Design a protein around this nucleic acid. Structure first.
Length: 88
RNA sequence: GGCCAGUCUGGCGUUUGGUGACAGCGCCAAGUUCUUCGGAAUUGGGAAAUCCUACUGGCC
């Protein structure tokens, strides 16, 4: 099952072939994603899990942001995705 | 495999919408119908839907 702060690669939709971050879990089928750059948290995108590829990387920055504040900022989403690309 | 609900000429751009196929807006291209021959108007197949191919979402 998906986790808050987990990296996904979008496989369907107009934003396909981008990496994004799961920022909310609705149920086991639907989540919300955002990247803090072109898709910011105030425009988070509803996605069927079948249209994402789960990646084995959860950003601690995003996960810690939600643990301490219940939210995530656009700056932390951008930083998490940038760190993911560099390491992986 | 079965059923329900969807999408429509091809291409690419887009921090627009859509879970998605896609759509919107844009321009490029093809077919077709026009022309004042500069350029306009259109759009899967089919005479037709409770039809069909392809594709998408859900259920079994």
């Amino acid at each position: 099952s998906p986790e808050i702060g987990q990296i996904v690669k979008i496989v369907k939709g107009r934003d396909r072939d981008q990496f994004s971050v799961i920022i909310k879990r609705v149920d086991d089928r639907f989540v919300y994603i955002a990247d803090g750059d072109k898709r910011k948290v105030d425009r988070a995108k509803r996605k069927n899990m079948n249209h994402l590829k789960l990646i084995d990387h959860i950003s601690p920055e995003v996960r810690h942001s939600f643990e301490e504040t219940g939210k995530v900022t656009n700056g932390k989403l951008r930083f998490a995705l940038k760190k993911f690309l560099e390491e992986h």
